[PDB]
RNA sequence: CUCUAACUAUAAAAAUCUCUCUUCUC
């Protein structure tokens, strides 16, 4: 190792308002939390790829000022009883993190998947739309 | 109809002596001269714009580039 | 800054959009000609044009 | 001549609430003039114009009338604004009302002063309104004091 | 330069060195180059022409509009209204007067001014209507270089038209003013103002 | 009349199975009737494979895949293009649509 | 006569409708 100060990217991409939240190896210390809704107007495109793109540029700049040069991606879906499929923005967030000079190591998916749900929201017939 | 323009006379229908010294003083220093350029400076009505513009072809105060009708294109004499 | 970049199309990926009036192409940068994007164009294009982009991280998404 | 903006600078800030008089509407949006500040133009887009679905624009905007808005982006080189209208909270409009009303009072008083003295509002504002706004945050409280304490 | 004797006496300036085709026998097509690299091949300065008037079949195939001389396209876009729609000799005269006026102001051979104004006044990113009815959206997209040329010509002529309407200035003078202002980035120009405002809309609607 | 001799469920000898929820609309649908699609995909698509490869430590890092079995509803399956209405003589065929790529 | 690899990603609103029906025998 050439002293690559490591962090974990720890992206959380729901179906709305994806999250980019870099932390140290322990994860107890949080730096550069800037989210998707932080930077986009429409309130409906918080999940849009452009939202995660700008959020990723901001976290990259902040972490580069910090001294962390390489990050560990921990992609998370909304998880739980919910859809638990990765959000649209998270992939753009990861791509923009990998663009802005940062080095990338050990991509992991850490979505909370249950041994079963307690109960899924929507009723027996579900969302009728 | 709707007189919201609120325009004034805004045009020298008849040339006055001081306005004559004005036309002559910036007869040069107006590096491009035309009827619209002349009336832009509030000092000519527009019919006498042609009169003053044609008179300036007396002692070569300005040179013609093209003398097509409906307009004129004049530059300073150098 | 003024990060205006250029991109020469290498292929045109049909015409998209609900209107049917926009197209989708695969552009490759004047620099680093091994780095390509897919981008949406609004107008007539063919293999050879040089688009001007104010972005480089954006990728085209099919318009519905 | 009504000019020389209320605040200490002619340009807006990034988050503020403001009130606007509409001047016209184009297809992509309306580039309108700010009244909380002096005269600088800026866009309000249809997608961020109405709260509900944008079925009509004539009923909502009512060009020539006064509305509440906010500002999201600013052009600080020659002057251009990006504004928003749907993101006006139920509490935002009330304080916009009071702020514009006090500003309108302090504007009309000094506009009368300029008209009676035939001197541009710029110099009068720089000589009187600006130091008072510096001292007490707003000149209207200073006017109330001058009514009471001279 | 070697005046050829003939039973018909063509004027000397028309006989001087005419392997040196000029636009109106006044402006050289050489020395004129396109600053931008994207819009080259969509601005036709390569072929010399003695008049900005050619009965060319420039609307038969798809992309021949590029091969039309750029000054000719400006002329054809000037003749745009019901009151004056077929009149093109008038458009040629207007363009000739505009070129002379631009030569007067900041000599800067007026073809180069035309080219620079066209380069500057064309938008580089635009929007399209993509909203599915219930939600109205404009999606930011890129513009073809040919459409950049077309749009630049369109706003230049539109600004000239709206400036000339019920105004003292002639159409040639207003067109020259717009071309001069769009040669630089002067926001006073209507065409450049529309370009900037459309681009900033498109930025606002990524 | 019977549109499907299998009744769609594919149960034939159980009486009752435990229902599962729809991924889109959360419809409590029996686990055999529900359409199950195994989405195995790349955690980073081909749009960013080059970028990640250039900007990653651990040379020749085998990037991981992501696996999810999606339990669609059936109204959702018709609507989300997952499954399509078929000809009455074509409903016979149960083999998957012939190996999209070889 | 020998063979299991590639892929995503749309759910705004839309209610109702007064006639009248007519033969096949080479
Ligand atoms: Mg339905
Ligand atoms: Mg049935
Ligand atoms: Mg089935
Ligand atoms: Mg049994
Ligand atoms: Zn369902």
Curated annotation (Swiss-Prot), chain A:
Where does the source fall among the domains of life? Eukaryota
Q: Name the GO cellular-component terms.
A: ribonucleoprotein complex; ribosome
The processes (GO biological process) annotated in the record are: translation
| Region of interest (Disordered), residue spans | 108-129
List the keywords (alphabetical). Answer: Ribonucleoprotein, Ribosomal protein
Task: Fetch the PROSITE patterns from UniProt.
Answer: RIBOSOMAL_S11
Q: Name one GO molecular function term.
A: structural constituent of ribosome
A Pfam family assignment: Ribosomal_S11
Could you tell me which Gene3D superfamilies the record lists for this protein? Answer: Ribosomal protein S11
Q: Write out the biased-composition intervals (Basic residues).
A: 120-129
Give the protein family: Belongs to the universal ribosomal protein uS11 family.
Recorded protein name is Small ribosomal subunit protein uS11
Q: Which organism is it from?
A: Kluyveromyces lactis (strain ATCC 8585 / CBS 2359 / DSM 70799 / NBRC 1267 / NRRL Y-1140 / WM37) (Yeast)
Swiss-Prot record, chain C:
Cross-referenced InterPro entries, in alphabetical order?
NA-bd_OB-fold, Ribosomal_eS28, Ribosomal_eS28_CS
For this UniProt record, the keywords arranged alphabetically read as follows:
Ribonucleoprotein, Ribosomal protein
Keyword Ribosomal protein appears in the UniProt entry: yes
Please provide, alphabetically and separated by semicolons, the GO molecular function terms listed in this UniProt record.
structural constituent of ribosome
What domain of life is recorded for the organism?
A: Eukaryota
One Gene Ontology cellular component: cytosolic small ribosomal subunit
Gene3D superfamilies assigned:
Nucleic acid-binding proteins
In terms of SUPFAM superfamilies, this protein maps to: Nucleic acid-binding proteins
Coiled-coil intervals, chain numbering: none
Query: Disulphide bridges in this chain?
Result: none
Classification via CDD domains: S1_S28E
Kindly give the PROSITE patterns that the UniProt entry links to this protein: RIBOSOMAL_S28E
A Gene Ontology biological process noted in the UniProt record is:
ribosomal small subunit assembly
Record Pfam families = Ribosomal_S28e (PF01200)
Entry similarity comment: Belongs to the eukaryotic ribosomal protein eS28 family.
| Stated name of the protein | Small ribosomal subunit protein eS28
Curated annotation (Swiss-Prot), chain D:
* Phosphoserine sites (modified residues): 50
Q: What is the effect of changing residue 50 to D?
A: Weakly impairs derepression of GCN4 expression in amino acid-starved cells
Q: State what changing residue 85 to A does.
A: Alters the binding mode to the eIF2B complex
Q: Where does it live in the cell?
A: Cytoplasm, Cytosol
Stated consequence of mutating residue 50 to A: Inhibits derepression of GCN4 expression in amino acid, purine, and glucose-starved cells
Subunit text: Eukaryotic translation initiation factor 2 eIF2 is a heterotrimeric complex composed of an alpha, a beta and a gamma subunit. The factors eIF-1, eIF-2, eIF-3, TIF5/eIF-5 and methionyl-tRNAi form a multifactor complex (MFC) that may bind to the 40S ribosome. Interacts with CDC123; the interaction is direct. Interacts with GCD1.
In UniProt terms, what function does this protein have?
Answer: eIF-2 functions in the early steps of protein synthesis by forming a ternary complex with GTP and initiator tRNA. This complex binds to a 40S ribosomal subunit, followed by mRNA binding to form a 43S pre-initiation complex. Junction of the 60S ribosomal subunit to form the 80S initiation complex is preceded by hydrolysis of the GTP bound to eIF-2 and release of an eIF-2-GDP binary complex. In order for eIF-2 to recycle and catalyze another round of initiation, the GDP bound to eIF-2 must exchange with GTP by way of a reaction catalyzed by eIF2B.
> In the UniProt entry for this protein, what further remark is given in the free-text comments?
Present with 17100 molecules/cell in log phase SD medium.
Q: What is this protein called?
A: Eukaryotic translation initiation factor 2 subunit alpha
Give the shown range, full length included: 3 to 152 of 304
């Amino acid at each position: 190792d050439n002293s690559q100060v490591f962090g974990v990217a720890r992206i959380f991409a729901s179906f709305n308002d994806t999250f980019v939240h870099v932390t140290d190896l322990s994860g107890r210390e949080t730096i550069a939390r800037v989210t998707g809704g932080m930077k986009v107007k429409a309130d409906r495109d918080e999940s849009s790829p452009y939202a995660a793109m700008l959020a990723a540029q901001d976290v990259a700049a902040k972490c580069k000022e910090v001294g962390i040069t390489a990050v560990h991606i921990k992609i998370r879906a909304t998880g739980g009883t919910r859809s638990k499929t990765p959000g649209p923005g998270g992939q753009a967030a990861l791509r923009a993190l990998a663009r802005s000079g940062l080095r990338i190591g050990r991509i992991e998916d850490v979505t909370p998947v249950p041994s079963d749900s307690t109960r899924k929201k929507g009723g027996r017939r579900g969302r009728r739309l | 109809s709707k007189k919201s323009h609120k325009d004034k006379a805004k045009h020298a229908v008849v040339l006055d002596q001081d306005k004559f010294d004005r036309i002559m003083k910036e007869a040069p220093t107006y590096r491009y001269v035309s009827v619209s350029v002349l009336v832009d400076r509030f000092k000519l009505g527009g019919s006498l714009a042609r009169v003053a513009l044609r008179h300036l072809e007396n002692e070569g105060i300005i040179k013609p580039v093209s003398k097509h009708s409906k307009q004129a294109i004049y530059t300073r004499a150098t | 800054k003024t990060p205006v970049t250029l991109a020469k199309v290498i292929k045109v990926l049909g015409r998209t959009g609900s209107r049917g009036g926009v197209t989708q192409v695969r552009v490759e940068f004047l620099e680093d000609t091994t780095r390509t994007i897919v981008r949406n164009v609004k107008g007539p294009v063919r293999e050879g044009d040089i688009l001007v982009l104010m972005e480089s991280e954006r990728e085209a998404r099919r318009l519905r | 001549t009504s000019h020389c903006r209320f605040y200490e600078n002619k340009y807006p800030e990034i988050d503020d609430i403001v009130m606007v008089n509409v001047q016209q509407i184009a297809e992509m949006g309306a580039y309108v003039k700010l009244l909380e500040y002096d005269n600088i133009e800026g866009m309000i887009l249809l997608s961020e114009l109405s709260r509900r679905r944008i079925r009509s624009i004539q009923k909502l905007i009512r060009v020539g009338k006064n509305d509440v808005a906010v500002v999201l982006r600013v052009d600080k080189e020659k002057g251009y604004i990006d504004l928003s209208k749907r993101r006006v909270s139920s509490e935002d409009i009330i304080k916009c009302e009071e702020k514009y009303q006090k500003s309108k009072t302090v504007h009309s008083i000094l506009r009368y002063c300029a008209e009676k003295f035939q001197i541009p509002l710029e110099e009068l504002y720089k000589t009187i309104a600006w130091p008072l706004s510096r001292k007490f945050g707003h000149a209207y409280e200073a006017f109330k004091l001058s009514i009471i304490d001279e | 330069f070697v005046p050829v004797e003939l039973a018909t006496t063509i004027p000397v300036e028309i006989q001087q060195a005419q392997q040196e085709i000029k636009l109106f026998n006044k402006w050289s097509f050489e020395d004129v180059e396109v600053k931008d690299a994207s819009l080259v091949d969509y601005i036709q300065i390569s072929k010399p022409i003695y008049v900005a008037h050619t009965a060319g079949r420039y609307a038969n195939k798809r992309f021949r509009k590029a091969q039309c001389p750029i000054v000719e396209r400006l002329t054809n876009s000037l003749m745009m209204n019901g009151r004056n729609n077929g009149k093109k000799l008038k458009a040629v005269r207007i363009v000739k007067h505009t070129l002379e006026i631009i030569n007067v102001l900041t000599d800067q051979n007026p073809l180069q001014v035309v080219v620079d104004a066209i380069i500057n006044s064309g938008p580089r990113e635009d929007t399209t209507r993509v909203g599915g009815g219930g939600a109205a959206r404009r999606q930011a997209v890129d513009v073809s270089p040919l459409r950049r040329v077309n749009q630049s010509i369109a706003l230049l002529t539109i600004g000239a038209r709206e400036a000339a309407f019920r105004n003292i200035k002639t159409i040639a003078e207003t067109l020259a003013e717009e071309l001069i202002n769009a040669a630089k980035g002067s926001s006073t120009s209507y065409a450049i103002k529309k370009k900037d405002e459309l681009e900033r809309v498109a930025k606002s609607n990524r | 009349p019977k549109k499907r001799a299998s009744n769609g469920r594919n149960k034939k000898g159980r009486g009752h199975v435990k229902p599962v929820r729809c991924v889109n609309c959360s419809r409590s649908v029996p686990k055999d009737k529900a359409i199950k699609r195994m989405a195995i995909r790349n955690i980073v698509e081909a749009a960013a494979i080059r970028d990640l490869s250039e900007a990653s430590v651990y040379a020749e890092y085998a990037l991981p895949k992501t696996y999810n079995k999606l339990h669609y509803c059936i109204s959702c399956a018709i609507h989300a293009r997952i499954v399509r209405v078929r000809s009455r003589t074509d409903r016979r065929i149960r083999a998957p649509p012939q190996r999209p790529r070889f």
